[PDB]
Design an enzyme around this catalytic site. Structure first.
Site, PDB file in Angstrom:
ATOM      1  N   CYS A 431       0.855  -1.243  -0.059  1.00  0.00           N
ATOM      2  CA  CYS A 431      -0.029  -0.052  -0.240  1.00  0.00           C
ATOM      3  C   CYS A 431       0.892   1.305   0.139  1.00  0.00           C
ATOM      4  CB  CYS A 431      -0.852   0.034   1.094  1.00  0.00           C
ATOM      5  SG  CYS A 431      -0.354  -0.540   2.873  1.00  0.00           S
ATOM      6  N   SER A 432       0.976   1.924   1.071  1.00  0.00           N
ATOM      7  CA  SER A 432       1.887   3.134   1.230  1.00  0.00           C
ATOM      8  C   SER A 432       3.080   2.705   1.717  1.00  0.00           C
ATOM      9  CB  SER A 432       1.191   4.191   1.939  1.00  0.00           C
ATOM     10  OG  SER A 432       0.619   3.926   3.331  1.00  0.00           O
ATOM     11  N   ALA A 433       2.909   2.256   3.278  1.00  0.00           N
ATOM     12  CA  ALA A 433       4.164   2.119   3.965  1.00  0.00           C
ATOM     13  C   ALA A 433       4.001   0.614   4.439  1.00  0.00           C
ATOM     14  CB  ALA A 433       3.922   2.723   5.444  1.00  0.00           C
ATOM     15  N   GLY A 434       2.918  -0.047   3.793  1.00  0.00           N
ATOM     16  CA  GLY A 434       2.926  -1.590   3.790  1.00  0.00           C
ATOM     17  C   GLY A 434       2.754  -2.182   5.398  1.00  0.00           C
ATOM     18  N   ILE A 435       1.861  -1.427   6.162  1.00  0.00           N
ATOM     19  CA  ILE A 435       1.719  -2.081   7.486  1.00  0.00           C
ATOM     20  C   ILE A 435       0.383  -2.158   8.160  1.00  0.00           C
ATOM     21  CG2 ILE A 435       4.102  -1.433   8.066  1.00  0.00           C
ATOM     22  CD1 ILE A 435       3.298   0.939   9.621  1.00  0.00           C
ATOM     23  N   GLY A 436      -0.389  -1.066   7.649  1.00  0.00           N
ATOM     24  CA  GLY A 436      -1.824  -1.024   8.226  1.00  0.00           C
ATOM     25  C   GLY A 436      -2.816  -1.795   7.258  1.00  0.00           C
ATOM     26  N   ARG A 437      -3.277  -1.368   6.319  1.00  0.00           N
ATOM     27  CA  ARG A 437      -4.176  -1.885   5.361  1.00  0.00           C
ATOM     28  C   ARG A 437      -3.413  -3.288   4.921  1.00  0.00           C
ATOM     29  NH1 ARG A 437      -5.590   2.907   1.123  1.00  0.00           N
ATOM     30  NH2 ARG A 437      -6.519   4.271   2.711  1.00  0.00           N
ATOM     31  N   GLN A 478      -2.433  -1.269  12.021  1.00  0.00           N
ATOM     32  CA  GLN A 478      -1.899  -0.210  12.899  1.00  0.00           C
ATOM     33  C   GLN A 478      -3.097   0.260  13.938  1.00  0.00           C
ATOM     34  OE1 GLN A 478       1.070   2.331  11.668  1.00  0.00           O
ATOM     35  NE2 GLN A 478       1.248   0.266  12.632  1.00  0.00           N
TER      36      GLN A 478
END
Length: 504
Positions: A431-437, A478
């Site tokens: 995704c963006s940072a690859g940890i939440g979604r 997250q």
């Protein structure tokens, strides 16, 4: 993470820092009914300054600082002096001494959410006298209840209950003695024994522990259940030195969010003579609660994707024989960039290093798009391999989807694809940072699998699953909002599968 305090007002902190800490003392605390908010309470000299930290889903965001994967990592970064924390007026702040507290949130005997009815049911069902348990009081929050199984019939066994009042900070079940924490009290009586309303004298010999976690469906009618997992990020504080080479500097979308060194993907076929060149911000994630004899899909979690790493991305996919790619964000959302493109437009054919990828088509849903890509190494344009790109496009920029059906279809499709393929590698999720979604999606997907593979009678420990992935990549899942989402999604999946029609 003992510097984390669950129920603690901002004002009550200044009180606690001023009466038990020193210059440099700090503690982390939540906002309470103000989702996406955390605050850092630093003790400067004789004053108590507060810094709010926001987290809308992609990462923790500190005001007058940088972005991080976890509160524990945030603390460690500033605590190592790795950077300059400052406040609007009073600039340059320092962190030195965590101010710890004892939160039972993870105690083998703490069950808070539990009601007196499901309390007596569970204790009498185990039948062993002197088995205790503590719970949240629905009557008046802030105060809990001590529920123990006695050795007097009333036939099953009589479960005596006891009230634990919280007189502003300190605790009391009614006696003249008070207690610092809930654990201090529970340990106290665990040896002393405790007299009930009547004359009766009970003993807390063993805490209640369950296992049959399956038809979670009823939990769906969390905040605590979440923060209870928080105090655990200590165990998963693995080395991430590799993503810290000054060379890989431009290979990180976020300076402080990096892959663990033990599960980081290593770009194959690289010049070993080039400092940092086998690097990519990405990790291999597996369901480690399974044994080698067990079967199941595996994944690779990655960050957004820079113009500088677009080709490195494609090398990962190729070497891993990855056939499916999952994107959980639009390239740019609400103004901030989330992930540069790495695919040609429909019909077009672009080259990214020793590879050629062609966009052979695009298919749309209200929630997402599927791009059927075709890739092959330039040095052999006849070795064509099929790779399907799944890009979710309806996720709320803030929070999580209102309903789970959208993400469930996404996942179901992704799954059928993977399954239908002869020897395909792990699925790439980013995704963006690859940890939440992405964390949220991989978990939902793992829990969807064991239910699908084993039956509806299997163990479905969401927390243990989330804690397990966090061991492979910092942050995974997250916010409390995704936590609940995993629950609501699964529950829907359960009912679905558990459909009435007995085709079995």
């Amino acid at each position: 993470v003992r510097w984390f305090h669950r129920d603690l007002s901002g004002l009550d902190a200044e009180t606690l820092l001023k009466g038990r800490g020193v210059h440099g003392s700090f503690l982390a605390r939540p906002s309470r009914k103000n989702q996406g908010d955390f605050s850092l309470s630093v003790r400067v000299g004789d004053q108590v300054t507060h810094i709010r930290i926001q987290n809308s889903g992609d990462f923790y965001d500190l005001y007058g600082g940088e972005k991080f994967a976890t509160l524990t990592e945030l603390v460690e970064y500033y605590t190592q002096q790795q950077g300059v924390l400052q406040d609007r007026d009073g600039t340059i702040i320092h962190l030195k001494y965590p101010l710890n507290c004892s939160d039972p949130t993870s105690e083998r005997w703490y069950h808070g959410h539990m009601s007196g009815g499901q309390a007596e049911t569970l204790l009498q069902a185990k039948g062993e006298p002197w088995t205790f348990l503590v719970r949240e009081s629905l009557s008046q929050p802030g105060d809990f209840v001590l529920s123990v199984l006695s050795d007097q019939p009333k036939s099953p066994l009589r479960v005596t209950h006891i009230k634990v009042m919280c007189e502003g900070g300190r605790y009391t079940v009614g006696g003249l003695e008070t207690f610092d924490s809930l654990t201090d009290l529970v340990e106290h009586f665990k040896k002393t024994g405790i007299e009930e309303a009547s004359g009766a004298f009970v003993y807390l010999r063993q805490p209640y522990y369950a296992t049959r976690v399956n038809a979670a469906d009823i939990e769906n009618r969390f905040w605590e259940e979440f923060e209870s997992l928080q105090k655990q990020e200590v165990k998963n504080l693995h080395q991430r030195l590799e993503g810290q080479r000054p060379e890989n500097k431009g290979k990180n979308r976020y300076k402080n969010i990096l892959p663990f060194d033990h599960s980081r993907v290593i770009l194959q076929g690289r010049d070993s003579n080039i400092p940092g060149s086998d690097y990519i911000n990405a990790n291999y994630i597996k369901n480690q609660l399974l044994g080698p004899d067990e079967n199941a899909k595996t994944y690779i979690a990655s960050q957004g994707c820079l113009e500088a790493t677009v080709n490195d991305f494609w090398q990962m996919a190729w070497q891993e024989n990855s056939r499916v790619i999952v994107m959980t964000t639009r390239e740019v959302e609400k103004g901030r960039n989330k992930c540069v493109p790495y695919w040609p437009e429909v019909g077009m054919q672009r080259a990214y290093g020793p590879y050629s990828v062609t966009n052979c088509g695009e298919h749309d849903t209200t929630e997402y798009k599927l791009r059927t890509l075709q890739v092959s190494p330039l040095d052999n344009g006849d070795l064509i391999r099929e790779i399907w790109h799944y890009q979710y496009l309806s996720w709320p920029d803030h929070g999580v989807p209102s309903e789970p059906g959208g993400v469930l279809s996404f996942l179901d499709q992704i799954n059928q694809r993977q399954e239908s393929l002869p020897h395909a590698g792990p699925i790439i999720v980013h995704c963006s940072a690859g940890i939440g979604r992405t964390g949220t999606i991989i978990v939902i997907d793992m829990l969807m699998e064991n239910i699908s593979t084993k039956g509806l009678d299997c163990d479905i420990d969401i927390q243990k699953t989330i804690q397990m992935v966090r061991a492979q990549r910092s942050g995974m899942v997250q916010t409390e909002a995704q936590y609940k989402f995993i629950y609501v999604a699964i529950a829907q999946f359960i009912e679905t599968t558990k459909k009435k029609l007995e085709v079995l």
